[PDB]
Amino acid sequence: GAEIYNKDGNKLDLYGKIDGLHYFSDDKSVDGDQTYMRVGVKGETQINDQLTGYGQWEYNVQANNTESSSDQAWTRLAFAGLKFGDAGSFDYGRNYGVVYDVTSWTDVLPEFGGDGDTYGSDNFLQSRANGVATYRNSDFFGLVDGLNFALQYQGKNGSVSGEGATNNGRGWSKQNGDGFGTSLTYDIWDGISAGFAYSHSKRTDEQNSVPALGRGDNAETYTGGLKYDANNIYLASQYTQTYNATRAGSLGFANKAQNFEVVAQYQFDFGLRPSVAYLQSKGKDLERGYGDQDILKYVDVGATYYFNKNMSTYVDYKINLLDDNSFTRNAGISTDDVVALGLVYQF
Amino acid sequence: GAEIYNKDGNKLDLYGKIDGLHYFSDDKSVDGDQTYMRVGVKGETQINDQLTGYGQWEYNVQANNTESSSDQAWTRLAFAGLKFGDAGSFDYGRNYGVVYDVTSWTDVLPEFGGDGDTYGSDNFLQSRANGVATYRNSDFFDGLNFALQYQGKNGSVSGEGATNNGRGWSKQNGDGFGTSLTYDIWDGISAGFAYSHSKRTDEQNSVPALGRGDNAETYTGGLKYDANNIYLASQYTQTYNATRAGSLGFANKAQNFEVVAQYQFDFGLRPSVAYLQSKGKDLERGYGDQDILKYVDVGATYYFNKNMSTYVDYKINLLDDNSFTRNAGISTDDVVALGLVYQF
Amino acid sequence: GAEIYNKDGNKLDLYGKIDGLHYFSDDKSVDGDQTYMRVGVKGETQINDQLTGYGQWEYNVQANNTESSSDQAWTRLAFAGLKFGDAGSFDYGRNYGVVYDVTSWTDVLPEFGGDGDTYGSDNFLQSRANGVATYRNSDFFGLVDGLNFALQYQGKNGSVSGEGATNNGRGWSKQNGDGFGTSLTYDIWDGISAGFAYSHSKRTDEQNSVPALGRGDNAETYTGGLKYDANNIYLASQYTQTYNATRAGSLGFANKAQNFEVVAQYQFDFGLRPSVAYLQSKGKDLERGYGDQDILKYVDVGATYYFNKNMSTYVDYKINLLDDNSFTRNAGISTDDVVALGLVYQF
Secondary structure (H helix, E strand, C coil), X not given: CCEEXXXXXXXXXEEEEEEEEEEEECCCCCCEECCEEEEEEEEEEECCCCCEEEEEEEEEEECCCCCCCCCCEXXXXXXXXXXXXXXXXXXXXXXXXXXXXXXXXXXXXXXXXXXXXXXXXXXXXXXXXXXXXEEEEXXXXXXXXXXXXXXXXXXXXXXXXXXXXXXXXXXXXXXXXXXXXXXXXXXXXXXXXXXXXXXXXXXXXXXXXXXXECCCCEEEEEXXXXXXXXXXXXXXXXXXEEECCCECCCCEECCEEEEEEEEEEECCCCCEEEEEEEEEEEEEEECCCCEEEEEEEEEEEEEEXXXXXXXXXXXXXXXXXXXXXXXXXXXXXXXXXXXXXXXXXXX | CCEEEEECCEEEEEEEEEEEEEEXXXXXXXXXXXXXXXXXXXXXXXXXXXXEEEEEEEEEEECCCCCCCCCCEEEEEEEEEEECHHHCEEEEEEEECCCHHHHHHHCCCCCCCCECCCECCCCCCCCEEEEEEEEEECCCCCCEEEEEEEECCECECCCCCECCCCCCHHHCECCEEEEEEEEEEECCEEEEEEEEEEECCHHHHHCCCECCCCEEXXXXXXXXXXXXXXXXXXXXXXXXXXXXXXXXEECCEEEEEEXXXXXXXXXXXXXXXXXXXXXXEEECCCCEEEEEEEEEEEEEXXXXXXXXXXXXXXXXXXXXXXXXXXXXXXXXXXXXXXXXXEXX | CCEEEEECCEEEEEEEEEEEEEXXXXXXXXXXXXXXXXXXXXXXXXXXXXXXXXEEEEEEEECCCCCCCCCCEEEEEEEEEEECHHHCEEEXXXXXXXXXXXXXHHCXXXXXXXXXXXXXXXXXXXXXXXXXXXXXXXXCCCCCCCEEEEEEEECCECECCCCCECCCCCCHHHCECCEEEXXXXXXXXXXXXXXXXXXXXXXXXXXXXCCCECCCCEEEEEEEEEEEEECCXXXXXXXXXXXXXXXXXXXXXXXXXXXXXXXXXXXXXXXXXXXXXXXXXXXXXXXXXXXXXXXXXXXXXXXXXXXXXXXXXXXXXXXXXXXXXXXXXHHCCCCCCEEEEEEEEEC
8 A cells, every 4th residue: 555645636656565585496497585576656646526547557676686687677567547437447558458357366375376377477468468458347337236347459569570570579478469358257146256258369470480389360268267255265266268378388379278276265363364276277289299288287285474464474385286298398387396485565 | 746755854756657658650660569657756955045955866667568578677867966046056967968958848749759859868968868967057147047067978888988887889978068058038938059069989980880070069059939828949950970870870960950839728638730850961871961850740638637648649751761761770651659648 | 764654553764865976997897977876665564562574675776877778777675574572583585694784884985895895795695695584683682782693594596507506596706505694793882892793605516617716615704893983983894704705806706815994984063074994805825826816905085075964975085006917907806096976865
């Protein structure tokens, strides 16, 4: 929270956290210090009785490498928008894709989970993305309480140079063409919710030529999710079928993929919040003889102790169930277990 | 604005904007998402009845690329200074060159214009620069503002012409100075003049193919009308070895001209029309006289209030594609910009 | 200072400085504009009567290069911690090594001194380091007033690739293995203090193979310091003996080294604060025929004028006493004088 300005209908919210974090793992690419911090600003201005303008900015700053290292900070979110009361809201910039409106229900683990597992950042509309225009409608205007739907469009994010280039070029793993997404969530009963999400994007020419894995003109995602959040109990499950949209590590994309996440949590009155979860990502029809491969598969057990709204500490144990093989080695998929210890100050 | 601290005579101002921006162009180096944000801090402390100290920092953060991209943020401004009441002020750090005291009068377009057009950043004293010492005097000890500015050498990465903060030839400079003078002859009518003289580095005279000379010079004159919901501003600058000729180097001499007309409606709409051109002369490699920049700008901005706005800007590029534009990398396509800005 | 939030027992402090700085030197790697700024956040939350949580973040942003330059900003500090009253405190993240608890007594020069001289940043536990767990006890609980001790542990910070790698790899100069440190300072009077510091770390494989200078499995530092700070007079001395821990420029580490810093200052009532100091770093038993070599040696004279608590200006003159030879030339150690002019706004 930490509202630092609230004068003349203009509110400024300064949020962020400092996370002293350490990983223990046989994977040397993962083991070691993981300390980082986040800094953010939420701003809001009242234009008239029916119109409110807003903007948000979220910045990730790593603190686990030296003062001469490179690329230690990056923007997670940055968008400006207008809210027209019950009509809805629209914003554009770097924001979360609507697919995350459902898959975030399982992104509640102490440390692991979320982007970088079954889905990644800058991975079409599955997570945070560049240049997304998002329309959101709350409670179906004034009709149905708990019914939310969103419509989203994303412009092409092409290559660095060449015919498929845009001003903000990237590598094939983080490219996209013109695409759209839609999400729909409803609370059938108190504490129980169901959600659906769909996204369809054009694939770029470099995605079909540079990597060895993944061929197709369109990336598609079908997502369904459930949530129970009542009586100090949190239960969430999420199943997604992707087409030419799930990353197969360094090697490319999977032609088809089935991702599944499920998590169970309980919140004690004195602050402890133990958590158990299972995540898997099944790839199908891979090129170069890989065929059907496990991209992700692990069981997560951990807990978080909340001192208050500004301080917490946690332990997270990722029990990796992947078997080391040619695919995991060539794609760069980690198969070792990791234990995470964190102490977080939030503001 | 958004002053967040004001206790015991010390004020701290937190300003900035978040700009959801998108470009439409046949030029692939320009087309696509352009979302960025800026965050800044203005600080002021009162030392005594006649002395006030201050510092400012302005930071640009791009938001149009991935979380693994590189060089997405940079400092636009960072300087500390002392104010001697009405007598004037002195400050040092990364600040605008005094040439911008006049050329900023035309830097009022919805999206385009300013640095990156007839002049650039780190381009001698034309815009934001490193290591500038600036003295400013108000009402000339009335209504007449004068500035004297000095900039230390900003050399190469290594070699004889190196400094601790080395750069490439396009953004290098030697020891230089500038001076500016603006006056309001009538209510709402202003005239300005600016001069700049800098030593050029050896790499600027050896590495690029275009531009040869020991000194960079700038002569600028400007007019501005700002009254009755009407804004009119014009600016003419003649440079010598100071206007960039794209990737190829500098123009030996160049004539830049900017003019803009705007109207502010009471309900928030602000349409804008402008014309910009950059004529390079006496270029090497057989180029001779070349158009570096030439376009007509039309657009408008709607201000919801002091914290929220939306704008569209259309750059009608009048440059003809030829050997010079292709080799220098100068865009000749049109650009359309759509933006939604939150300010704090 | 500049506390911007203080509500419901949660305080947020926003600090920093803007330093308009210029160096004059025959050394082209040092001469020119050195303008930079610092921004920091100090946060504190009260959990209960006996427990307080906190976090701090410090960010360095250079302003002396262009808007197209690279790696102009980096994190100096980022850690989260808990205070259990008189029992002590613990924090983890990027923080100062306990050796600096003593050597900071001489880090009081107008511009020079500190990191980059006898010791550097990311240099085992001598200065700011990644992934340090620090326990600190003040006044020996409540029993011995003015007696402070600290115990510190640092995990391995290995290479970018290979067997000795961690997730946050660096080059050999800023690598470390598992290490620990301890510090002890006592205030005999309110202005007279004595301090001791010890540090022991395992060395990485790249530190013994890539550089030409410095061989050994363990890095050690022994530090003792004296300080007088009363009656507008500041006197401080610090002597450190290192083993395979002092950097010998580009060539590697010194097998053993003796560092000495001494500084004398006086504070006038009208704001002027003249300063004189001497710093030296004597290397011993260097390979390739270097033997005993001077790594650092200069006399510092300067002054700082404080306008108030938020504005200051200073001049600092480094009179370099190093003679140019084969070692200084090959290691890249500057032997020229430097004059610094600074104007600082603080918030």
